[PDB]
Design a protein around this nucleic acid. Sequence first.
DNA 1: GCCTGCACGAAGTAAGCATTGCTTACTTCGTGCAGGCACA
DNA 2: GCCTGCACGAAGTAAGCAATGCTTACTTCGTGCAGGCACA
Lengths: 850, 850
Amino acid sequence: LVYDAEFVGSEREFEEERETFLKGVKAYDGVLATRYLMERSSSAKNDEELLELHQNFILLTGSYACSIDPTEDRYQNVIVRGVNFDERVQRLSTGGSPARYAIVYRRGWRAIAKALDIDEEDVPAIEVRAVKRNPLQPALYRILVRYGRVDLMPVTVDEVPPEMAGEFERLIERYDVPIDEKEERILEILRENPWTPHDEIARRLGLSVSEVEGEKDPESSGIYSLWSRVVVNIEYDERTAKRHVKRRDRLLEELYEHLEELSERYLRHPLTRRWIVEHKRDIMRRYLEQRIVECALKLQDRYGIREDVALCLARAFDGSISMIATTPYRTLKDVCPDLTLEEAKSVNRTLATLIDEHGLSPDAADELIEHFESIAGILATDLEEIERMYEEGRLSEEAYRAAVEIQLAELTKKEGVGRKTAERLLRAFGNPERVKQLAREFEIEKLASVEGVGERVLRSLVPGYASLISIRGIDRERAERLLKKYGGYSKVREAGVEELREDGLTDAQIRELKGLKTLESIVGDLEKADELKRKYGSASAVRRLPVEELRELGFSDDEIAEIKGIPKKLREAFDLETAAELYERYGSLKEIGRRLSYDDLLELGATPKAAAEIKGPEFKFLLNIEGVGPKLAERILEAVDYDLERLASLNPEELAEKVEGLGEELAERVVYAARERVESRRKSGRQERSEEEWKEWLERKVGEGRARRLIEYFGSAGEVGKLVENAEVSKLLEVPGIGDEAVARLVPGYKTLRDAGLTPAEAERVLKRYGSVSKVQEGATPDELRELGLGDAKIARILGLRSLVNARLDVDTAYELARRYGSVSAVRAAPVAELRELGLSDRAIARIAG
Amino acid sequence: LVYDAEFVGSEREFEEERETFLKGVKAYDGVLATRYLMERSSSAKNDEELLELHQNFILLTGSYACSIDPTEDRYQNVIVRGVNFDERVQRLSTGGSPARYAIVYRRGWRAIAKALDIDEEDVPAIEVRAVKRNPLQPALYRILVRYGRVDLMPVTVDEVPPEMAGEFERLIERYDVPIDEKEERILEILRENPWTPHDEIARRLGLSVSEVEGEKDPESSGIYSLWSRVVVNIEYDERTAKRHVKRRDRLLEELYEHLEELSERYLRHPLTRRWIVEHKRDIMRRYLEQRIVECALKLQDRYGIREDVALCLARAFDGSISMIATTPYRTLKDVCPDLTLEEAKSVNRTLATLIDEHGLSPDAADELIEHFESIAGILATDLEEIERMYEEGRLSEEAYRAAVEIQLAELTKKEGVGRKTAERLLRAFGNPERVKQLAREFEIEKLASVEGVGERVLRSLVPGYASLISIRGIDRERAERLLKKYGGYSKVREAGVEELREDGLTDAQIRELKGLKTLESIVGDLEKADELKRKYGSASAVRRLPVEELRELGFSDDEIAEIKGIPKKLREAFDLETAAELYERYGSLKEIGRRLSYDDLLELGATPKAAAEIKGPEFKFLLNIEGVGPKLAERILEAVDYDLERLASLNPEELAEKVEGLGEELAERVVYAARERVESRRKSGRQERSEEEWKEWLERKVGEGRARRLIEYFGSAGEVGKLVENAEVSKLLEVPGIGDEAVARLVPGYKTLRDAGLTPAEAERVLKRYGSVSKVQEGATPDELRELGLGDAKIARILGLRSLVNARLDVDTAYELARRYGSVSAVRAAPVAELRELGLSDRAIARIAG
DNA sequence: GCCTGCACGAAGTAAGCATTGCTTACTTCGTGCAGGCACA
DNA sequence: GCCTGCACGAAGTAAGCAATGCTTACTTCGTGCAGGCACA
Ligand SMILES: [K+]
Ligand SMILES: [K+]
Ligand SMILES: [K+]
Ligand SMILES: [K+]
């Protein structure tokens, strides 16, 4: 039953006892490991050195057991299986230590281990009840242990006196002591074999085992009493005690080396301390007591129960956590009076839910627990059953109301399900779990038969019904049929086009269902689109495929140029390989004709006309007057960095200053033509919205009502437009009726900044500082945004550095890896050594790779 | 604005108009595809045959447009951009058809397409406003279209009379008709180029475009009026009309072939009708009006709104569904007076939530929508803001109550969060979304600072806090530190052992966290266990590894035998390869010595003694009496199928009948020894629990209280035990205070059958029919369970056929694939041809592989 | 709305990661019988 | 509780799939201007 012991001593004595007990545990672990070696290999069983090691481990276990509680006061209230060993020792003539008198019994260590707070996970087992294969006399061994005779306990099999083993009688006659008839009858049987089991001595005599053994005290009758009378009359040798205490530690650490030697000899692998601990756990977890300890540990760790209360609960409920969690509070108090209400709430989650989340008294919670066991039990019980139990007076008012509210809460948490509809569903189908199961079974018509179960209720209840009913032409019964046939929306989406056509679905319905509109725009065949979705997934992944892989899949060159979005002037000037490479390396044809040289364009296979077309439209315009020459027009555009306004700006004399090989006669004509062009250009886009145009634009953006509300609030549409152009988010929001889904509709980029976690004021500051979200992404530095009051998390989120910061990198280093490289994928596949060059640890680079 | 038209005709006329409009749509699709070919490749643009094909498509589009509304009565109330074209045609002298007079305008088809219910998804575009590259005279073309002159509209570019194109004046002078001064001023410009744009004619004359065009009626001034006066004075040729009607269909289906030919010539790929529709959509979805149609279609399909109401909503709110979902009901009623309240609830999910789930009037719901836009908007707003708005009278009582209840419900749905604690959290942190964000940020101390936020609340709120706090020795602050450092419980679990040790975690804590207890039992090193978890995953996968792979990883042979659980009698008799193969092929040494022959065991390298030990314990007993011979003992055991009771049962004379080579003298001794052994066996296990033993067993299983409760409900603990042995689940459950988590504790196998979806009565029947769940799995057939009243779904669940039925296979075929094979993995990797042998489709086999 | 392609900006949309919920042997846990590792 | 290894049964536990929720450019959507497809 109860194993308990309380340590009442100083910190010094506490450390002494902990060290002694841990060393004894190591000794008994050596015992068990030697037994495992004996049984694991018959070749090891043949070895006599292994038997000597086993006996030496037994001797050291006994020696360490003798050193426990030397002052006879470190332990009190020692209990072993309900038996109070304190009063049992007090009733003995020679008194002694209750701790040592407890360890000599089976599993007595469980008491002492609780007094010293030794981690019960590693099974701190110490047993000194060896009979067969014991180097000493068993009863003498146990008596020496219980009397704490560290001087008489040998520390080596070679130092074992024959008067303590085979010739034990020589030690008895040396100290006289009276011997009664029962003890002589036991001794005349032990003379045949001193290691005879006490069961055999009791059977070959007609006595009980308790009669043969007797109390471990001189004033008794039995072999224990005889050895007690013999040992009491022996003086305490201080010299041998000190020398054994000094020797035994090195002796144990040497026996472990011998054990590892024998394990290497017979198993070719060692026996780790961790392995020995795990083996002890796995060989002793079979019996309850170990399951009780494991359950009490689980309670202490997960629910924070005190040690003694958790142990008592585990004893009372066979170490079953679920059993304790389905037990009412009054029963838990009956079995454990020291249990607190908070502890019971922590263990019984149903009790805590009722009491705290529903304001029930512990007695009403006990009512609900006794009648329905758990919250899931309540959710399983029909509503009519609870109503009947309430109307018959078998269920209190508060308990009934709380149970009904729990059942209703399980259904009202779905969108569209009110309380009247939840009650109707509970009346029609009994319990919320039955409703959930009917929803899983796609019983759409059965649920729709209930009053108030509309489209919203079905879409919130039946998984995937929304996705199918929203398709044009798919009826409710058709959606139910599809869901029941294929088994969920996922399996209907994974169905092939042929079997979907056999069911009567339109090709448009199948396209909408499988999401193939983009691949239908790419390839005019539905089956090939579905097969591409199967093989690669998204249409973007097909667009990212190399040219060679696309050619093999059955694509023409024009189809590849259309898929990758290659411009006409770029797809006609070069072949697919070079055009696609230039496009996926520079992005825009403008960048192609601005970063590459005219000679470079020609060398790649471009017609001079095509190469001029690839060059900017100003390049085609420079050569359209007096033939300034491509070699010279390219340098002219490289000066102003491809800008007609920069060309029309400066004085002609500055041209020959910047561009070499340019005469000043052509410079004036260049500037004149550039000014003419910039005057002809700024005459088309010279537009500022009028009043009516601003009014119509507002009505289009935020709708009629909010538009006229804003117009009245700020005066005219012009003021609203001025606020929009200046990104006056705060001024727009103060109007009642204008929210984020309207400001973001008016101010481009507001929604993205809001989804990044920025407050409207912060987003307003950012928009005023940088102009738009794009300019923020390709321009803002973390310190810059830190000056605007943004936290590092918001900065990382808005700059696109989420993946890099997820690798446990700060925002500054992530922005540097984005600056000195390219995108995130550019750092994902990066020179592993160059990252170490930048001062990143190997662990940081490994996390970058992950 | 509004595009609308109502069809007022017979079913025959309806089909006629649908066919005519679809043919015109195909013609205009050909027009657009020819333009795409002209623009896509300059080589195709150089081709004159492609230009002739384009002009032929234009002519056929015009011819089909002339055939719309022939009886002049099929359409009424034709509206194009708010302009009612019915009254506009009625005010003209020559009257005519409103449909044709609408089609000649930009996007006029949108009206007629709504009258004929043509699928607007495919963009039924019909335009006859071609100027450049028009084979006829543009104004003459449009007038012929508006007057429905199918006879005068040519069907081939070669059939174009010069008096209708370049020499158009010849057709004018042929019919006299007065010409005013403005029309002569337009004609003297058209004599230069008949295809001059009307914008150019208005600019090079000083008039407006409407002044140059004029009304399409004789009583007007303009080129339209001139051509109207010319065309009205021409008789309708019935012969040419009939002949064009007969030709145009074949002509169009031939022009499509010419288009495919040119596309193969210039693109090496064809133009599918689906591709053409998708390209038309992608080039016309850019303009607003098409977005309006797409939004109205989305409304009709997803929310079941009537066509006209959805169209009006899409027009009024720029085709944005989100704007409509954030628009109050009164505004929607203002823009659409015909809108019903149910439609508004279906489109605005927040409105529906408020009205139905909270019983608010439409005005209170509109209040909440205006102030917070959405339910998520309410969840984002601080509670103090709503309190201020209510106390200032700017928020009605009902709206404030509903908002507070929404905010509170967002937190009470988490276990451990009551209402007082939810209110305290909302006061401390403003809004529930802020609380969720603080929980994601692992701000555990900040949340714990609020009164009533205990361990359960934190575990329900902070993701992964439960997994870390439940570990022995990990404090709350330590768990917060780990979660903030690595970023979630997953990243703490993915952390290496080295960095976890650097953080101060015990090796036991790291083992508990990373789940390496089994791999710690296998390998006594934590780092190697972690590396094995990284490489292979689960310890069972390492156990399943072949012997050679285990040897290379650094395992000894004894370590491998321990990993795979090889018995001693099996690991010592053979080598590692053969022993491991026999164990992974037969599972138990009993099955080894039962399925294999004694000679087969000897041939594999087993000692006769070891081979007898591998044989069943009865094999060692038959040879222990009179030396019956292994060759004969094997047949004796093969007769009774390895059963001592079957041997002791029958008469000795039946032995020589079954086993050949057996004398009748040995048969009597065999039966005698078998009866002696079976009598000596049933004398040790002959145990049936007494009353006190049943009481103690009940107290152990279901606890003291429920045990005495059951004892009081029935006669004695013996009756409870009798009910348990017979699996009387129903009679045990009827006891008040006994639930599923106690019956399942009493009746082994009940929990598994319940988790399979079986009712207590069904689980009771199954347990009574088969004895235990194991016997059900390895013995019950689907038809048998169907006889017991179980549905096929429950049968699939209980028999382990979930994976096979998920492949859209019925329970019978899945059970057959489990019978005629092995496990589910045996069907996963199966002969693909042998599955076709059993009558499975290729799709079924493909799903089996997946 | 001339007619769209090239091009850019960015959230509208929806791919993709993460979390959460359900199912089941996927793995761990509890029990019993022989006979050795060895008795209250 | 002799002692534990072999072995089976099964839910206790927790791997593994499924659905749901969050974040963000991941993929589409909306807009503008150039110059041709080519004009109220
Ligand atoms: K803890
Ligand atoms: K529908
Ligand atoms: K506001
Ligand atoms: K009950």
